[PDB]
């Protein structure tokens, strides 16, 4: 059968498909050959404009304006003639070089110098720098705006239900109270750690012949200073510089890109399981469109995603780096997965974004479960008594702790405590023993 | 972009689309609809066939005719056909249900009980037995295929250089010797103890309501045995029973299978880095189509996959079977990519078997290598000498440990040993000192 | 510092050194070198046994003693002994083939065929019989019998509360009710399953030296079968035979043991998570010595300990059976790990059977909430309605979805169903609408 | 059996406790007891230093004195003292604060005080500042320096061999020259990369009470500022504030300290596995104490503990993180095992060094091997012949390429080139034919 999404086997390009579009213009085999255009002309650019290298005169603008276009508008159907050249290649980075020979023909100043495309290149110069490109594409076009749609999400929600008092749940059973908002606020405090962490990775690329040392520029053309050239050929792309590299570029920071993206996903799994429970708990019901259950079907969406992306990004962080003396071949097919972990990724930030616009918090059920849970009191009781210096306090509230206000009060007036103390104690409730988390919510803008 | 094998994210579905075709059919949601459609549709025909379900009168041969023919003429038209309808049930299983009533909305007496299609059934039920639909025809059409085909392959390298001498590597460095032959044998043996494994793995599957207990059943038909009915109806299908279970099979048989998948895909993984290593020692060379090298691409290109699958495999292995209480939604979604783990492996399979058919021995550089390895005639120099009760042997070969033929002969006629031994020694060579190496390629067969 | 249990810096021999002390006996040093000790003395029987052996003349019933008292008395002493050697030697197989003389120095008809001990033998001959030997062990007599305990557990608790009632929970939400019992049955089911699985693993053993083919055993001894000996010789020792190896036993079984135990221990992660959500949601209260809620943390001691387990179980299974040619050395360190991961599991056994034995469930609570949730009804009044052609059950019933006794009996009456049946619909419950989940509690025993 | 080097289970206290004596003070529970202590004790003297709370009056320089040598000189005796505690405690913080009350029983202005010991701190106040302590010690103290001691060995071996040629291998092949220091050169510079990410790790702390909102504190003493007084404390122990968490540190910091501590053992898994692969190609030799075979024994001990040690580090990392709600207990019992996969490491660390220290060039076994692959020499005349216009030099060379010296000075010498150029390449050999290689060598000490 052919592909489509009904038959594709995998559902990143199956049932979920439309969900990663923006994917297939990155990695997929399209995207890397987009890319390796890229590469190969700026390469040749490089060539022209380097007085050093006569063999290829400098381009006059409308030259270097049709190698631009070459770049920008590469399409499906360019994509599909380096495939066509391929089956006669059997190699995909010459089907590239012989692509654009086709493309510079009708050019007689770009024919001229048509065989210097690629010159001195081992094809994992072109490679890395294409799967860099990729990366570097993908986190500030689409991971990152998606992260910072998640950090809002939680946000609103922080600010939103800042003072709804919440029954705090460790080990399963009744703790000291928060809020929503409070909870909500520490999800977004850690997503956004990471997110700068993601932000600060290095993107690293190399160009420096078949194993790292310039070997066949230098036999060419001994007098120009190919590190130099290295060096301003990556950076130039908008990639940081990887000097030392065998055939390969090592994939390290490829490995800590992953590995901030798994670190991101499992504070998200996290959250999808939270929520998930507060539903069980009924704390939150169906938004406006007597309370409506929520179906979580979007966080568990998402958990299942997540699970998935990081069993992906995990394989990819550990084994990529690996690579027998100056190179294996193993890293080539594995590199054409580095959108198979993301892709699962973005299916689930965009489940757990569907999810939290669903969410409404039941005020009346969290208010009703706290005043039924006087227990908590036992935890300020037992510092005030401490402070005055009222001896055996931990035993006392164990023989105290049925539990009501009524119980309290009368436990609180039998102490040695001054009155200020006493009617501080039976001032409060469940519900309005949360401490600062309301200024903590207030205050997450600040960091 | 529209979806092709160009902007596939994942490779699975993307470069190696063709590779993969056998899991369109399978996997994909096209598969999972055509199974459901098989399961509703039995269900149904039961229904019919029992007498105690009066309002299903049984069918004659030519109503289930008709409805044999939904089953295995359903088509790719049929499968958009549901997916369509489910952009307004926003239900993938409630989708096949109109389907199904739509096919049979122009045959009287299947219109007539239009109705009971799904009674009584919860999503789970349907979908439980449409997995195990796929994995077992996964199993016998597409995996165990291509598990004989490398046994055999290997056997056949075995057999044809059974006696094909080589110096054994221990710690990479050389070791008593063995054959080519032997070394391959080793690899067919193991893998056929996990075909046998995987062959004897039960595939499960359930029918028995919403959490696992018959409750909807018993509601509608008190006096019907729904439990005989639901071990019958499974069995029916060509799938083991598995009497208990919430609202979701437990999944446990999932990770039976894939866990025997992926110790037959470690073997592989060994067998293709060994193999990468004896073209590296230059022990193998390219198959006549002055000794040529053998590019190992093939292997690589299946250990990458290898790893993947694994990965993949690995992580619905363990995470599938843990679901809360009764059941959370989060297989849903990771079952779409129960092929996954397969085409990872399907590709590599593919691979080792394109690798294989380009291998040839080297003969003159294994017997050159071997011939100027003597050091390894000092273990069978030992054991004799231990034999005949001659003192400090370890010692007294260190000792002696450059050597050659002409060193070895004189220490053994140094010995203090019976002639006719001095002459069974002196015949030895590392090339012909390969013990029961011979004999145990040609007693492969015999396990 | 010196080791001691507060010293240690694995829990495994710290904090919980004490839990699991029987395998201290097992996979430690000392229980390798046990094991050494037992192959060397049988292989040295062996020898004497075979009559074409005449070097080692057939032992005496008091010779045949005075080993088996070697081996079946080997204490801390005597592996120290065999450590201290192993300063000198710097090989820990050859310091306990010295140890072996020494013992049998005083002794005349042993001392005289103590240069045989070893005889031919390549050191893994020895170490994978030693890890068939501490695996087959370990199964039998400890992680068995927990399994055992658990399995028995479960189904005390199936029987106990095969009738108490249970408001179900699909993705956390009140679904088609169940027993405590039944849902107690489904874990044992499973458990039983992987228990057989475990039972059923084969435990592997090889003996053939340096690299599988008995190259210095024929040098020798070129008229004894030494393939038939080796069948002999792992068999006697209760180890099922691996044929073709190379200097390694390729580890495979391993990987089968430790995958199995890995699903039991998945389940059990499973069954501990959801116990710890049922505390949560007061089902289950501390079993009497007012209900008093009990602390999880014995479920989630043994939580945390299972996801190591497994971490550790799946890291041998995957990476022990690749070996680099005829072996790399990276084995033997890690086969120094084997009760590593068991030490974990044994923990988390130990944990849940002692969580296990505080619950109680608290009928009263899960009657209560039961009553409150009269939509789980809407179930089997569908099928009773769809049952007799009643149209638009399901968007009558969504219609009618507050929904109490009253309001469900008042429906029910208005429908156009036989009155025996609106009287059998009118006498359910949530709590009494449990199907058949008490019936199938009670055949739990004969599956 | 009693606890011993001999008797424990994990090889990391057992067979090679040794190794890892280091983390016996700091990963064990006598660790833990021992910042456990350091914490309460500090908590006690910020509170005397408050002015605001004058329940604790400020504490004289005795005072002070006293308290500081109890976590200065903390030794086994009193953790054992603790331990005792904890058999009637059955709360391990709990028999800890005990322990300080009997310690300062004996001072009057300290007894004075002692109830405010602990005060409204929750378990997990002084838990997760214990763990922060811990590994900021290892990092420090333990790890950081072997990761040098490493970084140090490689670049040693790249200055000691700078010059030395190496045939390249890529897919186990004959490529393009480079030299043996070189190829440590890689390896030096991403290890550095890791060294400068795991230095840059921030290491978290928290105290706020139960459930991260201070509600104890602030019930006590109302006027306090807590926010302030918490970041003030956690920062007074070196370590970094974590404002917002729930009743424990959420672990995403231990999860980033555990990846770069991965990347780096998978760098040095690459380093092992290259090494045993120079050695097997006999590129390296025992140096002196005819070249003598160097045992790789110690790199494929490094390599098999390192990846125990990424399985155990990856499972924490992935793991820790996940917490039911305010906290679930899980993670208690598997933050024992923090020093578990630093120790896997350590052992390696170790391994690899004693490993390096073994290693000396095979200078003529290289310089031989690379005298007979002249078809290296490929590749430079294409890309001079490529700068001077000559067509189809691929083509050419393809044609061209068994291959010597002459060889290649004929076909040179048929070239359309300048004499200069001819001359040139007629002057390379595969020996000299390695570009960049020494230069890249000597300035890596800039990067």
Redesign the interface.
Known sequence: ?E?????????????Y?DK??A???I????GLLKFRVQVEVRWLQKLAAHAAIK?VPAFAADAIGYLDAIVASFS?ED??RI?TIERTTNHDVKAVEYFLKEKVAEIPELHAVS??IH??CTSEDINNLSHALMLKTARDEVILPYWRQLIDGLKDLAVQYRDIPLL??????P????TIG??M??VA??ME??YR?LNQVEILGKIN??????????????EVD??QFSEEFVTSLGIQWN?????IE?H?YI??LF?CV??FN??L??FD??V?????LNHFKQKTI?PH?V???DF??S???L??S???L??L???L??????????????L??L??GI?YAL?AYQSTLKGVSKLEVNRDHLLDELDHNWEVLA??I???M????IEKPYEKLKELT?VDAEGMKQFIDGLALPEEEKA??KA?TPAN?????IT?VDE?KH?
Chains 1, 2, 3, 4 share one sequence.
């Open positions: 059968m592909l489509s999404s009904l038959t594709a086997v995998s559902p990143v390009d199956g049932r498909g990663v579009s994917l297939r213009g990695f997929s085999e399209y063999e499906e994509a599909a495939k065989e210097f010159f001195a705090s749940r460790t080990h399963g059973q703790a000291t109270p928060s409070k909870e606020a520490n405090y850690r750690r990471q962490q012949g078949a194993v790292g040392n310039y070997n066949a520029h230098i036999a060419a053309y001994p190919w590190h000097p030392y590299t065998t055939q090592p390290d490995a800590e590995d798994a670190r499992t504070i799994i996290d399981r939270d998930w429970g507060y539903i069980a007597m259950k179906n979580p079907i568990e969406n958990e299942g995603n699970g998935l990081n069993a992906v995990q394989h962080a550990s084994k780096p690996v690579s027998r003396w100056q190179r294996d071949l193993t890293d080539s097919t594995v054409r997965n959108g198979v892709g299916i935890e300020p037992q510092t005030v401490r402070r005055y210096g049925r501080r104690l409060m023993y949360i401490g600062r988390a903590m997450l960091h």
